PDB file of C-alpha atoms and ligand atoms in Angstrom:
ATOM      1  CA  UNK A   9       0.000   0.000   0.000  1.00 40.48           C
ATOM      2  CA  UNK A  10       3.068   2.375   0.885  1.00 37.40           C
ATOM      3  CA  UNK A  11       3.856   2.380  -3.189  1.00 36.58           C
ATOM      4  CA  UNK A  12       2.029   4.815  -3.863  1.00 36.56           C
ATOM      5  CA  UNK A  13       5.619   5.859  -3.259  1.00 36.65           C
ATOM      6  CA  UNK A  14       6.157   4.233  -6.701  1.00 37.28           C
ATOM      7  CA  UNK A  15       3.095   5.582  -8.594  1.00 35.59           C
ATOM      8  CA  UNK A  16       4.583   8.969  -8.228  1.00 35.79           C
ATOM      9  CA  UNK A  17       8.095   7.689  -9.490  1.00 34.54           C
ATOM     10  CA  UNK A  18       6.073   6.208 -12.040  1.00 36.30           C
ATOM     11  CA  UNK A  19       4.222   9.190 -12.662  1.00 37.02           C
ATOM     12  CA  UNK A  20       7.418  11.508 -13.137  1.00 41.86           C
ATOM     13  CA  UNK A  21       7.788  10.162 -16.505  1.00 41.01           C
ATOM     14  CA  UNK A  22       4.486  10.747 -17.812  1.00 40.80           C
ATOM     15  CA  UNK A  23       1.926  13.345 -18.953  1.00 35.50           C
ATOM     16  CA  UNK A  24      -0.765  11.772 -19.248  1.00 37.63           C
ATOM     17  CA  UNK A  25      -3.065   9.062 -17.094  1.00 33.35           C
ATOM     18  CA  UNK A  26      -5.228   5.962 -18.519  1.00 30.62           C
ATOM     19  CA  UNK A  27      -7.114   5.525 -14.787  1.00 30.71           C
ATOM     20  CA  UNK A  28      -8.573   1.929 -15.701  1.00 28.42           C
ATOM     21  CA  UNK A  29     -11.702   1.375 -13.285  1.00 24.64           C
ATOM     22  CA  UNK A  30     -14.455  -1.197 -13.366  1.00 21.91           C
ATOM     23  CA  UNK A  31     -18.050   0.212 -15.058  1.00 20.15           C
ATOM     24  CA  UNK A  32     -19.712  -2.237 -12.438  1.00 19.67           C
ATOM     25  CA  UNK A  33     -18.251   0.044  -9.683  1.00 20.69           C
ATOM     26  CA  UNK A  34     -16.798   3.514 -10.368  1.00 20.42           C
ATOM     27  CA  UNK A  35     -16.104   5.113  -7.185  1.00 18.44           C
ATOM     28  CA  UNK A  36     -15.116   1.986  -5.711  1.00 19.90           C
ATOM     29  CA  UNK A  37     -12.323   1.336  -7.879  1.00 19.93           C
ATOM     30  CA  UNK A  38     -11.083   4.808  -8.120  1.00 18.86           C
ATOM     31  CA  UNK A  39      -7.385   5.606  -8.022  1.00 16.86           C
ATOM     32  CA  UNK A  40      -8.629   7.515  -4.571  1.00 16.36           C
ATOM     33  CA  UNK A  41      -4.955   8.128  -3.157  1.00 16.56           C
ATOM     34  CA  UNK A  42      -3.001   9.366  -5.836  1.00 15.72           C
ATOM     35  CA  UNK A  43      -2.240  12.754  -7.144  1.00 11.96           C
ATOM     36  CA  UNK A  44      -3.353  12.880 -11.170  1.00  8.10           C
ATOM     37  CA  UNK A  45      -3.810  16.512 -11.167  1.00  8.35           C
ATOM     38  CA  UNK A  46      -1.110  17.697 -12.991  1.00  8.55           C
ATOM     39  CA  UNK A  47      -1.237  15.079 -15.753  1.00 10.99           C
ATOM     40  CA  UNK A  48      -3.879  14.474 -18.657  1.00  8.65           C
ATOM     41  CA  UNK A  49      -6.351  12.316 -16.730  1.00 11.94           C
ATOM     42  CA  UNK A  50      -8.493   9.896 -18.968  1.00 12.85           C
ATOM     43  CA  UNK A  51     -10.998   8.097 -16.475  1.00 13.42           C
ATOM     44  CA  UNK A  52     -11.640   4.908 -18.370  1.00 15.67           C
ATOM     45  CA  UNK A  53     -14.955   2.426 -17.163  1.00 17.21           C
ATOM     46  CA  UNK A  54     -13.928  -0.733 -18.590  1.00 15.87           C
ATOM     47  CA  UNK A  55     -15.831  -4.108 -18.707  1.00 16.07           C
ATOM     48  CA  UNK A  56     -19.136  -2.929 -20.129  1.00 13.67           C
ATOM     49  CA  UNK A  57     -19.583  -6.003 -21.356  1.00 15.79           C
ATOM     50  CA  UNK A  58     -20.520  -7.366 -18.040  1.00 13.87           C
ATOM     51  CA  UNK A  59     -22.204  -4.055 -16.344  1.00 13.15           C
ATOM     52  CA  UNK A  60     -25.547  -2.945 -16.145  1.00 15.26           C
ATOM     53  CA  UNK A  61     -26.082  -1.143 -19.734  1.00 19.44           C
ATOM     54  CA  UNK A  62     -28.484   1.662 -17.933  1.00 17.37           C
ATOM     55  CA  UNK A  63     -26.514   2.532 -15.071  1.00 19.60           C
ATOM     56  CA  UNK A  64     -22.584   2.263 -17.090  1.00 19.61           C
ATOM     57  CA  UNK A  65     -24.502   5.173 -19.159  1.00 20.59           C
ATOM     58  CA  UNK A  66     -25.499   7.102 -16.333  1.00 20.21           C
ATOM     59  CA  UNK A  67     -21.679   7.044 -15.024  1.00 19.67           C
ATOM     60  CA  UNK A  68     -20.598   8.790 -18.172  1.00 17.00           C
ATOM     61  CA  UNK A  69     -23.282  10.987 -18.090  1.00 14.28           C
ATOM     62  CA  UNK A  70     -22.431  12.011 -14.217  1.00 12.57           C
ATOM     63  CA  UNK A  71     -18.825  11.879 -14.737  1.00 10.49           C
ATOM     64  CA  UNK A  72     -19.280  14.420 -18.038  1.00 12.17           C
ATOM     65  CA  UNK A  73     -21.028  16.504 -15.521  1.00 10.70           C
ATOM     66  CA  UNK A  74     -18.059  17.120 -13.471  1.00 13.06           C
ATOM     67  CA  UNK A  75     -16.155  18.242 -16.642  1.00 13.08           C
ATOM     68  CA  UNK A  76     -14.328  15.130 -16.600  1.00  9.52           C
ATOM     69  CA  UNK A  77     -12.853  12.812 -19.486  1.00 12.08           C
ATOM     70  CA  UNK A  78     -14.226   9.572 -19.583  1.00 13.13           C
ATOM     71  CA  UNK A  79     -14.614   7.006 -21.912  1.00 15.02           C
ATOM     72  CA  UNK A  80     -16.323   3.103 -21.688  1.00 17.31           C
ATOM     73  CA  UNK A  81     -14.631   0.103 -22.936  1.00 15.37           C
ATOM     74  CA  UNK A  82     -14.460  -3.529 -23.042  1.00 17.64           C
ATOM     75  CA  UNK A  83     -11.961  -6.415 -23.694  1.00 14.78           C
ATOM     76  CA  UNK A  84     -14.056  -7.185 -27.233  1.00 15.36           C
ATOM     77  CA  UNK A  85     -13.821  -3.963 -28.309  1.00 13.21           C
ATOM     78  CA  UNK A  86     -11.554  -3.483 -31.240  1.00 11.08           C
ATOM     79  CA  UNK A  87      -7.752  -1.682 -31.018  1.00 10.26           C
ATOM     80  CA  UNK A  88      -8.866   0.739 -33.588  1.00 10.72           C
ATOM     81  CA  UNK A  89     -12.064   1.760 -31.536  1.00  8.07           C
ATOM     82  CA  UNK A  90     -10.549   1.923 -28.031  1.00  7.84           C
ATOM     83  CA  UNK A  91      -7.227   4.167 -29.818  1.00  4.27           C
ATOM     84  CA  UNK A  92     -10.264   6.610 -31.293  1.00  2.20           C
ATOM     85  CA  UNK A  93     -12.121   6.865 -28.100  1.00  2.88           C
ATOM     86  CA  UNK A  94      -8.712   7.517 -26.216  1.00  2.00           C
ATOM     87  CA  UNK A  95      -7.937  10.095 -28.947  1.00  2.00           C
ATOM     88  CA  UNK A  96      -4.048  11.181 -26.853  1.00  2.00           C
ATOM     89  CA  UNK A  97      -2.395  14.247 -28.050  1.00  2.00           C
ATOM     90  CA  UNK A  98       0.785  13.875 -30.245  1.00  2.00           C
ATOM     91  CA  UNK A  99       2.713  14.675 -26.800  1.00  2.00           C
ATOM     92  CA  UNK A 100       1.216  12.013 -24.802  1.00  2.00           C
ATOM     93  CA  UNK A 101       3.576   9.923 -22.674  1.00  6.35           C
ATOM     94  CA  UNK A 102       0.900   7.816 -21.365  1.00  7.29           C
ATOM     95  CA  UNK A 103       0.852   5.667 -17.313  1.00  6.09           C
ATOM     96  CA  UNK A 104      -2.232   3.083 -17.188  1.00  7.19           C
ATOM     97  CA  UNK A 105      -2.861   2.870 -13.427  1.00  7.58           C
ATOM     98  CA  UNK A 106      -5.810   1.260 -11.344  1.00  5.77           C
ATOM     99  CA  UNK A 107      -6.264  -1.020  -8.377  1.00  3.38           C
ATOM    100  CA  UNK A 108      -6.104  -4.752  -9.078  1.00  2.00           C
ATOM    101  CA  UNK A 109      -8.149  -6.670 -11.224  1.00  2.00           C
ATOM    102  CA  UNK A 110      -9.723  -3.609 -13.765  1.00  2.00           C
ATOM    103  CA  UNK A 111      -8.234  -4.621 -16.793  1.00  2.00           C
ATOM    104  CA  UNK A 112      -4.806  -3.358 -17.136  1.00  2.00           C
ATOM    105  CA  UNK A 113      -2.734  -5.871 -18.176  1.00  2.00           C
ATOM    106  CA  UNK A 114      -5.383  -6.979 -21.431  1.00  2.00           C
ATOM    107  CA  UNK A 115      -5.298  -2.914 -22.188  1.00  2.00           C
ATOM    108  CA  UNK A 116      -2.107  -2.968 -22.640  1.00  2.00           C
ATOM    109  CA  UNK A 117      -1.907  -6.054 -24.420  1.00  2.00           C
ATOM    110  CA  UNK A 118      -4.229  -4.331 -26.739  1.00  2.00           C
ATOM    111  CA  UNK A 119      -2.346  -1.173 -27.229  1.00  2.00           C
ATOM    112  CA  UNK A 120       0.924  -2.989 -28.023  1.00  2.00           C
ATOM    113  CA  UNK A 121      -0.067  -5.822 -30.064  1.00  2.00           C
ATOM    114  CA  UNK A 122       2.671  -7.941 -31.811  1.00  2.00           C
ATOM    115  CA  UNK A 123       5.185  -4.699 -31.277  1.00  2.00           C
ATOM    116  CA  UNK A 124       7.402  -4.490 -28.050  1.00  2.00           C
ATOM    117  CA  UNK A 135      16.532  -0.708 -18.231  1.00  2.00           C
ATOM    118  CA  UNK A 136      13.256  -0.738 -16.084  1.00  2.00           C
ATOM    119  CA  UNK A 137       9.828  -0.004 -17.314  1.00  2.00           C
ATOM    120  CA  UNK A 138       9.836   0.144 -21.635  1.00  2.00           C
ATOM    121  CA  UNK A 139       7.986   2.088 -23.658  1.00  2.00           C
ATOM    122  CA  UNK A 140       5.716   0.860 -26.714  1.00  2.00           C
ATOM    123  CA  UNK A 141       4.802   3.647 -28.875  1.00  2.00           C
ATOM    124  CA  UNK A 142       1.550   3.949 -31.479  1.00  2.00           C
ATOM    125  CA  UNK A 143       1.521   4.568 -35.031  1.00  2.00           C
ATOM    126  CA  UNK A 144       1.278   8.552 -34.729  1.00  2.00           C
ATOM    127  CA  UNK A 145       4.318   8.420 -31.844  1.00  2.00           C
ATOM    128  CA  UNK A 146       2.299   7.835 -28.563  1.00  2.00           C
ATOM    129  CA  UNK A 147       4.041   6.864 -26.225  1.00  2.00           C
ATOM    130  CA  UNK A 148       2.514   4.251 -23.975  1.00  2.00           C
ATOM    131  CA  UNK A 149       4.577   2.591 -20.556  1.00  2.00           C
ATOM    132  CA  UNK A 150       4.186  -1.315 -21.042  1.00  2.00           C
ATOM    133  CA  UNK A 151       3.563  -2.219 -17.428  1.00  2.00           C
ATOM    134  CA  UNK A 152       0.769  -0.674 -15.467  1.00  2.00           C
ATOM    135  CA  UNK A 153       0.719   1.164 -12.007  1.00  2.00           C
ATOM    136  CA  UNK A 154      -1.530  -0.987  -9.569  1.00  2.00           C
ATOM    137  CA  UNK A 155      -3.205   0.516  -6.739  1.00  2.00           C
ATOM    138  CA  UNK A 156      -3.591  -0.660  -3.121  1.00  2.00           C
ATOM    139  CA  UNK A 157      -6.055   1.781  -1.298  1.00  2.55           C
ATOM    140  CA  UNK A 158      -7.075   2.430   2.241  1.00  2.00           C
ATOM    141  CA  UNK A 159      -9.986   0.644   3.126  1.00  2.00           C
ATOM    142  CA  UNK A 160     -12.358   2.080   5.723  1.00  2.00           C
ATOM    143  CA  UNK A 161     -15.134   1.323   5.174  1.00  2.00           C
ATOM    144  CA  UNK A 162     -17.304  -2.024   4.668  1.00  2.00           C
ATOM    145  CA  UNK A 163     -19.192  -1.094   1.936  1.00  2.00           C
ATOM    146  CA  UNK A 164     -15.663  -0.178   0.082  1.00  2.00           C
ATOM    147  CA  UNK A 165     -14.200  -3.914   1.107  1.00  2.00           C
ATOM    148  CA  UNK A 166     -17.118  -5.481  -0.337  1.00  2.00           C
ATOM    149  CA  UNK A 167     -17.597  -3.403  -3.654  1.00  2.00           C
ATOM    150  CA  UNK A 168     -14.061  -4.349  -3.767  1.00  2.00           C
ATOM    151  CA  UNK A 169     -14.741  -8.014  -3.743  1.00  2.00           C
ATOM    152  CA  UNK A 170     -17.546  -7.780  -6.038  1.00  2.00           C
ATOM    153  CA  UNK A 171     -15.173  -6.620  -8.693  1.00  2.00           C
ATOM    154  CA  UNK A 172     -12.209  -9.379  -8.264  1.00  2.00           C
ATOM    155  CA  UNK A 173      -9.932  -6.311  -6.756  1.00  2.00           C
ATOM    156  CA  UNK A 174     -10.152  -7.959  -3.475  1.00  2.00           C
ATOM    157  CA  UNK A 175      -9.676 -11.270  -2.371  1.00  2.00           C
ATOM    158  CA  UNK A 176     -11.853 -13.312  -0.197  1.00  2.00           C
ATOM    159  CA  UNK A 177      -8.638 -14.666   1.679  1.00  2.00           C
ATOM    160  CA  UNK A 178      -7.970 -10.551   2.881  1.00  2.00           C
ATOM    161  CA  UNK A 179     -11.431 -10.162   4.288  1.00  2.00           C
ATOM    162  CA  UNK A 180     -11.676 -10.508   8.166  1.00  2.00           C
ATOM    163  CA  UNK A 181     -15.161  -9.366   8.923  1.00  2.00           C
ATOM    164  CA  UNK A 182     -18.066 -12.003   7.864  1.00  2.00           C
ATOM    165  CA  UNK A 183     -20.160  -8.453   7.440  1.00  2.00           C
ATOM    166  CA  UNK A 184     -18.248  -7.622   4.502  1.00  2.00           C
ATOM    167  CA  UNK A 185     -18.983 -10.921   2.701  1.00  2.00           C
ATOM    168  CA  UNK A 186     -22.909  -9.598   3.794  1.00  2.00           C
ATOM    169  CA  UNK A 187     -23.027  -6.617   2.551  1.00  2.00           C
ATOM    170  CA  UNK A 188     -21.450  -7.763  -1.040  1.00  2.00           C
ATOM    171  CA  UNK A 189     -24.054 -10.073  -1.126  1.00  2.00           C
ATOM    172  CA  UNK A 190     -26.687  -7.627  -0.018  1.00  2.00           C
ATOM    173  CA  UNK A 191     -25.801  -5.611  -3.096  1.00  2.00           C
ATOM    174  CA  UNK A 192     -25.374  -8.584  -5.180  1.00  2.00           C
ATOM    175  CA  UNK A 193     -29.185  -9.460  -4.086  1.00  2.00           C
ATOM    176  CA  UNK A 194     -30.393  -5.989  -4.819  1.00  2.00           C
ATOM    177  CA  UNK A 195     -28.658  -5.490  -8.278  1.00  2.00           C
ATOM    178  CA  UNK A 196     -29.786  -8.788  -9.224  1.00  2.00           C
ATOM    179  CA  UNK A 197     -33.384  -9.069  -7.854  1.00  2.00           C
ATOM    180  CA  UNK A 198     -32.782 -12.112  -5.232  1.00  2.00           C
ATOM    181  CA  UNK A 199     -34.070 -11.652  -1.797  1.00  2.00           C
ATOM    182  CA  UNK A 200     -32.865 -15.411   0.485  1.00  2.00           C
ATOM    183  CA  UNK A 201     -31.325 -14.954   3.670  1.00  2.00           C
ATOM    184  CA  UNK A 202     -26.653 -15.144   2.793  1.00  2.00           C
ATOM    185  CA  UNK A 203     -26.914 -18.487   4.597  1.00  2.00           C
ATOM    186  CA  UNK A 204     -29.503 -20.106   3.039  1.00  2.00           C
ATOM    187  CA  UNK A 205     -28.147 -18.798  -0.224  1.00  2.00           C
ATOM    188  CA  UNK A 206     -24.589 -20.109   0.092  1.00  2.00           C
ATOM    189  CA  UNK A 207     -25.530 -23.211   1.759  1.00  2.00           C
ATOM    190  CA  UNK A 208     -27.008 -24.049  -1.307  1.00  2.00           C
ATOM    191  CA  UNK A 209     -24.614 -22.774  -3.363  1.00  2.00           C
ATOM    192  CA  UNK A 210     -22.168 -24.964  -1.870  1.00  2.00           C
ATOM    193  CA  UNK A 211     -23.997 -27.586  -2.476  1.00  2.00           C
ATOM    194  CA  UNK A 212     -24.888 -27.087  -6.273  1.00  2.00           C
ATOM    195  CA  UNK A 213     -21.280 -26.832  -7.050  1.00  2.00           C
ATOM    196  CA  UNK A 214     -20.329 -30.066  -5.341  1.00  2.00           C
ATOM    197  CA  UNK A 215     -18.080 -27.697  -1.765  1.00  2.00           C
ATOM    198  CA  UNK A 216     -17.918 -29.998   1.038  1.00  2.00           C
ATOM    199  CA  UNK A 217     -15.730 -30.615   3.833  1.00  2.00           C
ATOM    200  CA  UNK A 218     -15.132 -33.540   6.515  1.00  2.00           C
ATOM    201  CA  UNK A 219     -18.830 -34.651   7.624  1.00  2.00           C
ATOM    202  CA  UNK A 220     -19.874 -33.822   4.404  1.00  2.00           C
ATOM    203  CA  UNK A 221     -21.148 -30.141   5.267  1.00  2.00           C
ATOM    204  CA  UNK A 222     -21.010 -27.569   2.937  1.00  2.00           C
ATOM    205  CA  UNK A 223     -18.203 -25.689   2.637  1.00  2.00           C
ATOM    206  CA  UNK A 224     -19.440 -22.032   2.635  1.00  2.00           C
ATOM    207  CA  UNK A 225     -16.225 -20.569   2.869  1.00  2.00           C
ATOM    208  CA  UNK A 226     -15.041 -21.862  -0.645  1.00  2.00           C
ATOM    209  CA  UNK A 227     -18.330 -21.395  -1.571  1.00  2.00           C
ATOM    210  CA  UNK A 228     -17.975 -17.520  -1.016  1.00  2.00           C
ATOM    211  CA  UNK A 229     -14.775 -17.344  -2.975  1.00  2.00           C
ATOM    212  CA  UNK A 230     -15.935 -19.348  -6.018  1.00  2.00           C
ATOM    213  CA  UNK A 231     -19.097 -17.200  -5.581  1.00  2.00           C
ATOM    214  CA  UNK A 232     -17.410 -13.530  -5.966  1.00  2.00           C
ATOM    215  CA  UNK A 233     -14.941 -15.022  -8.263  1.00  2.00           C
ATOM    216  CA  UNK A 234     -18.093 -15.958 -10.662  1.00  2.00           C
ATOM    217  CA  UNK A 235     -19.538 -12.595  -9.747  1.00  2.00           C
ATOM    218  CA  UNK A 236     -15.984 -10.249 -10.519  1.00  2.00           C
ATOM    219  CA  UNK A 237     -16.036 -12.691 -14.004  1.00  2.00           C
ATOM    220  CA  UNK A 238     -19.234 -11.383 -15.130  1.00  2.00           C
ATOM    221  CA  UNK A 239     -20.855 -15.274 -14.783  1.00  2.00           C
ATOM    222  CA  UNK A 240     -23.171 -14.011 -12.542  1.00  2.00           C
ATOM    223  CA  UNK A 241     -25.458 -12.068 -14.618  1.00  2.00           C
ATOM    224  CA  UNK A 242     -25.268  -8.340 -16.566  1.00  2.00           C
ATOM    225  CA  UNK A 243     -25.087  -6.347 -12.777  1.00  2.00           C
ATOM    226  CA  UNK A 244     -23.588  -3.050 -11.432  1.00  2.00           C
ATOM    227  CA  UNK A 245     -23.197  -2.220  -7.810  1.00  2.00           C
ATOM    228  CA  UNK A 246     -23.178   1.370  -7.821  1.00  2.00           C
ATOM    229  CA  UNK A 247     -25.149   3.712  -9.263  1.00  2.00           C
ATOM    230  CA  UNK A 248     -24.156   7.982  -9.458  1.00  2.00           C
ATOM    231  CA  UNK A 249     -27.050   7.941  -7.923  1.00  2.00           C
ATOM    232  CA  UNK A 250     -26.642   6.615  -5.152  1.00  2.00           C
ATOM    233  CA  UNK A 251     -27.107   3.171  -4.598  1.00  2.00           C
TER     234      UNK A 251
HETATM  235  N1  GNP B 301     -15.739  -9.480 -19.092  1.00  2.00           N
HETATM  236  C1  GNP B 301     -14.559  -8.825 -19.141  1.00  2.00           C
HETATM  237  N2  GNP B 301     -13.508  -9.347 -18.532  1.00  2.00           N
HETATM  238  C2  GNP B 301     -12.389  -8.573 -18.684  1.00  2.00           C
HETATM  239  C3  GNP B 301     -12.242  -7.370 -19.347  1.00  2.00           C
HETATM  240  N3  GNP B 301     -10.917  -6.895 -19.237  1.00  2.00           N
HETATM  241  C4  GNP B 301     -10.307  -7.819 -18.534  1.00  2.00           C
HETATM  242  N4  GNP B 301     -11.145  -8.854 -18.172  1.00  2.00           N
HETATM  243  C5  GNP B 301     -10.785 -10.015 -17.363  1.00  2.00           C
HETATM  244  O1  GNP B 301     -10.471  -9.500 -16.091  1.00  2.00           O
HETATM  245  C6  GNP B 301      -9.393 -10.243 -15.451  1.00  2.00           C
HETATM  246  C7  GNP B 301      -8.263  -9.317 -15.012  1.00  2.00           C
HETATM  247  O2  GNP B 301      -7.676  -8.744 -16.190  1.00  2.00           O
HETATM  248  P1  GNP B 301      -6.249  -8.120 -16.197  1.00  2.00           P
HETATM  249  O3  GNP B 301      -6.118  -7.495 -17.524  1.00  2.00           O
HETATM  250  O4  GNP B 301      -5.278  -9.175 -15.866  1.00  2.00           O
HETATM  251  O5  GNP B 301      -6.352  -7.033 -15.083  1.00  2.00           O
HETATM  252  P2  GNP B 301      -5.244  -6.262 -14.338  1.00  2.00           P
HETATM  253  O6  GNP B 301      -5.789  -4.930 -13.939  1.00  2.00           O
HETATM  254  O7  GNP B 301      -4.012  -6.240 -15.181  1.00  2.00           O
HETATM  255  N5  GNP B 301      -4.948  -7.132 -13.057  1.00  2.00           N
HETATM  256  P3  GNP B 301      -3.907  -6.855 -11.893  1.00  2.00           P
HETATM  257  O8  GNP B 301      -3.339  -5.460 -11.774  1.00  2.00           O
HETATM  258  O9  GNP B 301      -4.659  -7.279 -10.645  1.00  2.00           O
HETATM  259  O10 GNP B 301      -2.785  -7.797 -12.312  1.00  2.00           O
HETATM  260  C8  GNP B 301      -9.029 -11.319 -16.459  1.00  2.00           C
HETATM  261  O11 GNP B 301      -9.788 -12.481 -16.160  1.00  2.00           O
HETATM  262  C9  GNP B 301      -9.492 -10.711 -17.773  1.00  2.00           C
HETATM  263  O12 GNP B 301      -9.754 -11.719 -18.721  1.00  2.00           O
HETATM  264  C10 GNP B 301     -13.386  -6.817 -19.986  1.00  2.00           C
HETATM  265  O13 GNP B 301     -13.473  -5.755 -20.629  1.00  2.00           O
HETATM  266  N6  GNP B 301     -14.527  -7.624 -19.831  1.00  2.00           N
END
């Protein structure tokens, strides 16, 4: 969590800022922390694919609202398209940064393609510059509703969480972006036992059922859902 530290010597050698967060949750995964203010900062809401259609539009529209650059984009969504939408200058040294999970790594991928002393550089067509390895990062988390927002989105892992009221609360908001209302116990004891998670005595396993759960869930396998809305819930 300390680096940080490194963002900002990662940050001294670029202009601009690719902040990759997930569509499902935009505040949540926020590069909260970090000082972007006196680079180019492109806010980025990736994995449309698997977000609520209605409410990833309703992020732009808020985020537009605070005069801010955003654009949406998904893993399936060609080079050509993403390289239009990101439309950098012809100064543009470029940092993609976000906490775990968001997409980074396939960006890039992207970006570079079959092309290729610390960090390197890959550079477009026009020039671009773009750093091949992103920033990732590690925030403070205070709150619950943060933690399990977090988890929801893969950024998290279920081996990190301490407090059993986390694991509720991402499934209360699970529930409610979804439509189920079940009790969390009744609903991962059977979970556990559709996908075959039991321990010694044969009793479900609800502990592996939870991380197999929010893994599905962070994948998209869970259904089309978004767990924040502008909005605000
Ligand atoms: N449905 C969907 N999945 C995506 C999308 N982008 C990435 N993923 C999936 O999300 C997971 C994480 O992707 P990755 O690019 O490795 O993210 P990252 O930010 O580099 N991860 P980290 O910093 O934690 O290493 C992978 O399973 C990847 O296939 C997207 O637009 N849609």
């Amino acid at each position: 969590e300390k680096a940080k530290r490194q963002i900002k010597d990662l940050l001294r050698l670029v202009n601009t800022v690719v902040e990759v967060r997930d569509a499902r949750a935009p505040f949540a995964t926020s590069a909260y922390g970090v000082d972007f203010s006196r680079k180019e900062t492109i806010i980025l809401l990736n994995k449309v694919d698997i977000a609520d259609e209605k409410t990833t539009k309703k992020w732009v529209e808020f985020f537009k609202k605070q005069g801010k650059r955003v654009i949406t984009t998904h893993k399936g969504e060609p080079r050509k398209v993403l390289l239009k939408k990101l439309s950098f200058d012809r100064l543009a040294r470029v940092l993609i940064v976000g906490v775990p999970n968001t997409g980074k790594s396939t960006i890039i991928n992207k970006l570079k393609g079959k092309r290729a002393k610390g960090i390197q550089w890959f550079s477009l067509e026009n020039g671009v510059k773009i750093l091949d390895t992103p920033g990732i990062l590690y925030k403070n988390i205070f709150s619950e509703d943060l933690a399990a927002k977090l988890l929801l989105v893969g950024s998290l892992p279920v081996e990190r969480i301490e407090d059993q009221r986390i694991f509720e609360r991402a499934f209360e908001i699970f529930a409610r972006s979804i439509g189920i209302e079940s009790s969390f116990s009744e609903f991962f004891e059977d979970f556990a036992r559709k996908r075959g998670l039991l321990k010694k005595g044969g009793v479900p396993d609800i502990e592996r059922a939870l991380m197999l759960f929010f893994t599905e869930v962070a994948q998209g396998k869970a259904g089309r859902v978004s767990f924040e809305r502008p909005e605000d819930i």
